[PDB]
Scaffold this active site. Structure first.
Site, PDB file in Angstrom:
ATOM      1  N   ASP A  51       0.886  -1.317   0.401  1.00 52.10           N
ATOM      2  CA  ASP A  51       0.227   0.504   0.232  1.00 52.10           C
ATOM      3  C   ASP A  51       0.890   1.157  -0.103  1.00 52.10           C
ATOM      4  O   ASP A  51       1.505   1.845   1.140  1.00 52.10           O
ATOM      5  CB  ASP A  51      -1.079   0.085   1.038  1.00 52.10           C
ATOM      6  CG  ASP A  51      -1.767   1.302   1.052  1.00 52.10           C
ATOM      7  OD1 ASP A  51      -1.677   1.974   0.153  1.00 52.10           O
ATOM      8  OD2 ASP A  51      -2.437   0.952   2.437  1.00 52.10           O
ATOM      9  N   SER A  90      -0.754  15.799 -11.856  1.00 50.49           N
ATOM     10  CA  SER A  90      -0.987  15.390 -13.425  1.00 50.49           C
ATOM     11  C   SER A  90      -0.708  16.823 -13.789  1.00 50.49           C
ATOM     12  O   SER A  90      -1.795  18.012 -13.282  1.00 50.49           O
ATOM     13  CB  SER A  90      -1.954  14.426 -13.117  1.00 50.49           C
ATOM     14  OG  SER A  90      -2.581  14.784 -14.514  1.00 50.49           O
TER      15      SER A  90
END
Length: 330
Positions: free
Chosen positions: A35, A199
């Site tokens: 994770d 992004s």
């Protein structure tokens, strides 16, 4: 040193991935959920409340010659999905894919929430976010990666998750055979303890690319892609009959649909998520309404590039003094 381990979907939807991990001496092999959005290595154990164990493999520290109680240490964690676990702490030898760390904090669960109990395939979590998020008190502990780092040939790990197939986690090297083209690296903020990046924009299907900054985290422990409501609405508007269902808890679409791809930007590069990756199947067994793999982050407080996004790429988690992320097509 290096390590290399195969990671395997737990079910036909890729709801999560499990990676075998050796703990203790002799080895006890548990299948953990790696994770990158958390920083605790915790396991089902001989200490876990018996009614909360249903098929998981447990770690039994008393059978490990190298286990040592970390006296006084406790832990307690709550995840973004509402799940939780807590317990006490041992140090022990932990190996992943041939890479060994001695003295790793292994957090032994005394209590787990119902979602953990109900998932027989996941024996615990191995956190790969920054050690600043580790929950052990009163002495915070390091992640497996942070403890391995100085020994690694390069201070990196990579995630290469499969679509409906196994993939690979590598530690200490970048497998130049595992991706196409070049790797685009992008800056990381560690301020919230995550692999947080920005992004450069998105496209829906064959549509034009929208240049827009989307800050979010690279999180292998989250199944879906959670993005701002504007972006998500623009995606689902291209699917006839898709709608946000407050009763189901997100966007659903007709199982008869063919989904468009979704592109996200990494600097000047682009990662394309095929439409099939966004199908999470019937909302309930036999339903003709299917659950979408792109959902709004509006009720979270952060955008999450979960497995839907990451499995479309070869992802480099660069743990150098100044961390960075890299993405390549594959």
């Amino acid at each position: 040193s290096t390590g290399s381990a195969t990671t395997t979907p737990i079910d036909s939807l890729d709801d999560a991935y499990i990676t075998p991990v050796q703990i203790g001496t002799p080895a006890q092999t548990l299948n953990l959920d790696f994770d990158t959005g958390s920083s605790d290595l915790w396991v089902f154990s001989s200490e876990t409340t018996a009614s909360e164990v249903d098929g998981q493999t447990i770690y039994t520290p008393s059978k490990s010659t190298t286990a040592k109680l970390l006296s006084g240490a406790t832990w307690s964690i709550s995840y973004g999905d509402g799940s939780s676990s807590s317990g006490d702490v041992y140090t022990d030898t932990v190996s992943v894919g041939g890479l060994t760390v001695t003295g790793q904090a292994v957090e032994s669960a005394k209590k787990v929430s119902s979602s953990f109990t109900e998932d027989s395939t996941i024996d615990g979590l191995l956190g790969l976010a920054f050690s600043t998020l580790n929950t052990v008190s009163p002495t915070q502990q390091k992640t497996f990666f942070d403890n391995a780092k100085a020994s690694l040939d390069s201070p990196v790990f990579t995630a290469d998750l499969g679509y409906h197939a196994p993939g690979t986690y590598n530690f200490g090297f970048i497998d130049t055979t595992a991706y196409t083209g070049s790797i685009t690296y992008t800056a990381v903020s560690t301020k919230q303890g995550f692999w947080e990046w920005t992004s450069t924009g998105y496209a829906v299907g064959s549509g034009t690319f929208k240049s827009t900054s989307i800050d979010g985290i690279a999180d292998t422990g989250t199944t879906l892609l959670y993005l701002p409501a504007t972006v998500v609405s623009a995606y689902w508007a291209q699917v006839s009959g898709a709608k946000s269902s407050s009763s189901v808890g997100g966007y659903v679409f007709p199982c008869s649909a063919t989904l468009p791809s979704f592109t996200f930007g990494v600097g000047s590069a682009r990662i394309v998520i095929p439409g099939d990756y966004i199908d999470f199947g019937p909302i309930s067994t036999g339903s003709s309404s299917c659950f979408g793999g792109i959902q709004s982050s509006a009720g979270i407080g952060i955008n999450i590039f979960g497995d839907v996004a990451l499995k479309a790429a070869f992802v480099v988690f660069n743990g150098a003094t100044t961390p960075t992320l890299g993405f390549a097509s594959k």
